[PDB]
Assembly symmetry: C5
Amino acid sequence: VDGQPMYGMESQVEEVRVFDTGVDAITEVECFLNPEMGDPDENLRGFSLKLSAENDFSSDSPERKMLPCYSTARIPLPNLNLLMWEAVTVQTEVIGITSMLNLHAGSQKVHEHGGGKPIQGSNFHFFAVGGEPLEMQGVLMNYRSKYPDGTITPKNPTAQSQVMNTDHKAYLDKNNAYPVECWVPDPSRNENARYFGTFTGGENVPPVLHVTNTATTVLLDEQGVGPLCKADSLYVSAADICGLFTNSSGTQQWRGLARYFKIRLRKRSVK
Amino acid sequence: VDGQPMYGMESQVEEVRVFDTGVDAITEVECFLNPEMGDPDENLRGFSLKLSAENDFSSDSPERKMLPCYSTARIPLPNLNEDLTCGNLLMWEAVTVQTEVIGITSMLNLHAGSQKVHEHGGGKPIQGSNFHFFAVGGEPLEMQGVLMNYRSKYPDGTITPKNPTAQSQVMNTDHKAYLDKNNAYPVECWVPDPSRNENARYFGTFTGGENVPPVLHVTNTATTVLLDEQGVGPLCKADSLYVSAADICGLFTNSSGTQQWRGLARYFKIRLRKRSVKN
Amino acid sequence: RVDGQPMYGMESQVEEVRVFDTGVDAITEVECFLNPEMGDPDENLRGFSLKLSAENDFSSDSPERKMLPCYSTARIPLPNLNEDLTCGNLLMWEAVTVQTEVIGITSMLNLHAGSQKVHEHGGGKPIQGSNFHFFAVGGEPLEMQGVLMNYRSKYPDGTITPKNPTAQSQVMNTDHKAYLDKNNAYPVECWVPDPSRNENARYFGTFTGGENVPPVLHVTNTATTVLLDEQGVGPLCKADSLYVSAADICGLFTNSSGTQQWRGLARYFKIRLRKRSVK
Amino acid sequence: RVDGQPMYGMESQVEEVRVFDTGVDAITEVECFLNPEMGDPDENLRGFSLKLSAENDFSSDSPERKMLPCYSTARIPLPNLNEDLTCGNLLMWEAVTVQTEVIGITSMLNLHAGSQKVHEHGGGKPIQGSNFHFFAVGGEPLEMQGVLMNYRSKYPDGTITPKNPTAQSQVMNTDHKAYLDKNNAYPVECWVPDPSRNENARYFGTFTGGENVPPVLHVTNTATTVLLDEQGVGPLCKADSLYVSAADICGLFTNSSGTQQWRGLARYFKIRLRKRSVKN
Amino acid sequence: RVDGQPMYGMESQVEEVRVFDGVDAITEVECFLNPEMGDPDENLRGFSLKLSAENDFSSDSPERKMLPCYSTARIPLPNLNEDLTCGNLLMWEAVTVQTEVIGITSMLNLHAGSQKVHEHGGGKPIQGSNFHFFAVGGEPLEMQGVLMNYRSKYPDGTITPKNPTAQSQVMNTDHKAYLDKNNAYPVECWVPDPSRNENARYFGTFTGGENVPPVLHVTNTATTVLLDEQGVGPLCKADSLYVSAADICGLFTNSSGTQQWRGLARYFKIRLRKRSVKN
Ligand SMILES: [Ca+2]
């Protein structure tokens, strides 16, 4: 899996803490994923290319830099070997939500003499923690969409690809390649990961984003077993499309933000 | 019941797992229902025909491909009483269900088909009136008919309240039906009958209006318990499990201003156990 | 006496009576429905009001009967329990739980009949705006308090409204006490359940006001309201009579002309009763 | 001293007093109501404000009395418990629970009287926009903190507003402490419950601001607010006085002319009290 | 150093210190933070300068008085160790916090300054993008910088991410700061750092959009518990308690159509206990 770097010089692991009261040592990993909104030039990191509109389904050829893609990373863990790292809990929030209080830069005035238009409209907030790559199912608004070089989209789509077509199974195995609009986490798989997403659609939808270091998601299933890290690898996945930025011209760009992860792991004996 | 296929080549059962630690054997059935929004041509699977408007109640003849219909399927289960003696009935009991709508991110395509929100703007998101509904039962879902307009003339290929009257716009107890055909019972004509469905659990939210935002959640960590107050889930009569859905996500608005319903498939993971019952 | 929707005879709105008897603490379930009373301006528009007037000065406000939604109510007769008991023993039916939902919420997905196009080439306008959803289960008729938008409103023949209203009738006037003793007569806009009484009933209501309010309605056979108070006592059925009350104004229907009508739906009730010893 | 809505005598807004006493731990329930104080611009428009002015410069902002909704409050007198007790024994009434709802929420379904048509041939405009729903139960008067949109506002005779306001009065100015000691005098726009005080009361408020905000109002006789703190102690009625406070601005009524008036409704209270032994 | 809003001396924003006492004495500290919205002149305390619009990302130079900043204060606490022998460390531990925004009803003034909503109408309520945030810690709040536009040129009197790059619009780990100065860290530049703040609890909700209604609750019955999973609250390491807030309520629209941020103060009641710790 070719994800965002989680070792070496550009590593997005900010801290590793070990809590050891003699038995059942907990390892906490603090890391982040950057959004992959399309980045139309070197200065507009975290934005998409301006959106096209009204393309007939027969001639729908979106530009690469217009398509937000899923973020993912493989975090390498110490080799234990059968003892496996088990993901127990995750704290996660979107980083930089207050940046949207800048109404002076770039955004269309709401009216004569007014401030800039806030980022608003369709948003998607999603994260996953797994012991293997996230498993995706493809579903398309329009099966005839012609997707650009550098994206991975449902192969040999049909009209059924607009509903459920079981041919479209993929691993989230490349960062910044699987367009959010083409793929969802596969509810029929991901037996070894936990995923969470909310889509809110509409022109005037307000973004609502919460931050707190007091909220924890438990990753243990009903049997008290968390995701188990195959090949000593921990997989984090995100999509955080916050809404649409409206320029003075009236053009619209997706805006995305990074997601923080604190994952608590323990060593677990397994068959 | 003539539903979406759940055996053979086109079966919409994706996986059957059996968890057997000697005693409490659980069978998990993973399946999906496709939406039945009307499918106006071979390319627009999951959409309706464009919506007509302002038909007088006296001349209201909606086209078949304009009407979303309920989805349903019969899942066949192993026979349990094949190797048992008289007086012993083992039945499959639906204990829990995990369900979510499949492909909710597809609505982040604002480049294809949808009217610009304003000059130089992106496409209009799918929005407006939506209905999200699912049912798990040991027999076909039981429906009650209610009509906006009793005089509506419904097209060939649909099953709608027979001999409607003005009372059919409120409660008319004549309009009882089994959801016994997939893609035939128009969502606008039928609701789950609260007076029946003693052997199923159903769940539905209608949200009406022009600008209603769709709000859809996905997670493999949420489970609905199907057991009643006595700890009994739906019991599968004739070794048949029934899943039913309607997932009208909202209205798609074309450049022209024409509007089509957009629907998505629903996933089901149903946990079943064997239960001893009298006779 | 209470002159409600019929709950015995040929036109009875009791759909089923089940008795669950495992030797002790027999439960009787009553399944019934109330139809909405939105005004029914002609024989074809059952469940709708007359079109809404606007801008009447408070000094000349004379709304038409068929424009005013009214509260629904019914007396359900129960078996006599004291026919076969000796003196000093009073057995009463006690309402323990209620399952209730609005019947036919999907009927609002008909956007082809009657409703004004949302824009050129568009579908019909969904029902939306001000709504009120209310139900009560009691052992006696529901007790009402009158409050008026405008005390000078002149209410039509066939309605019962606050007698001798004053400016204080626009806030709290304690003269305006009434029993919900007639179906389709007490205008919703004039009356609320009296929080100062109803010691022997449970009531529940949500008002949502505004032009563009989206309707949100849930259906499920898995949700139960417990009617027991802190002491574990439900409503007690005086004179062996169970009282159900409802108002389900779903929002406003907008015609092609731009005229608006209230749309209402029926409400289902499943009430669990047990026999209780009382002094 | 608190000059509130009448809660004894001929005009008393106590509707019922029920006593439940099974020999021990007697509960007294007090049922009462507060009327809204929206401004009442003439004798016929009880429950409404004067039409709203707009665009007054901060330097010349002189709102009319009948344009300002005010807090409602009342002192309910309770029996003395200490008349036949000896020195060193103090019994006080303790507020344990409250059931409260807004009275007359369905009155807003009158779209035929007074309200501007929503469009040609349409019904009247529903009441909507900025609303405030607030209630308090206490063993002493409600304690208020003043905060002003505009400190230079000149408030009319008949109102009590922050004395000698400053620019800091638009944020937190600790000079602006008051008791809610007069019904229909403390303008809602000038005052909030003081979170730094009210140790002997429980208060609850939601403000929702905006042009198109829908009113959402619930009624049920099955919902109870527990007034007990973490130690299981409710407000103590220290001079045998129970204090109820409310503000229920439901939104704006729009006339045919386009003028806007606040519309308010009364609030019902059922308060359960018990007798509690307290130290001298 | 933390140069915050005064919490000792004549201008102290500590309103009360209560002690509840035989063994586990609780000290309650009641204080407030004022908002720092920019205060464009001596009369407009709690407001920002009118907002500019449409600055190209390459020429974005916002004025100081246009930028809301985070509020913070260091509250000094009694020394506990003055009469203890070495190897014994008593520290103040923050257990709970009650907090609300002060003066939410001030937004019911629709007569002063605000543009009429329409001819003959009242003033436009404050509405749009808002941010409500508070923190309680035993050390200064730790911030991460993120920018809408990395090329923004921030005015003298602010502290903003040093040497920003395109990555500063997403996650750039160079932008670490302590909230060490009141009215200097612009809200739009900084968030609490989830990678740090091991010794504080923070809570924030951003709601963006033109027409967002402000929703604000007040009650003295709601408490936030600050204890972690081990039952340990923030520990005030140098006998210093840190409170931080940002309460941008929305936009005020003048008659001209110009817009200003409006902010309000936040109250804090913090319950502290003495806790024995290792040196
Ligand atoms: Ca009573």
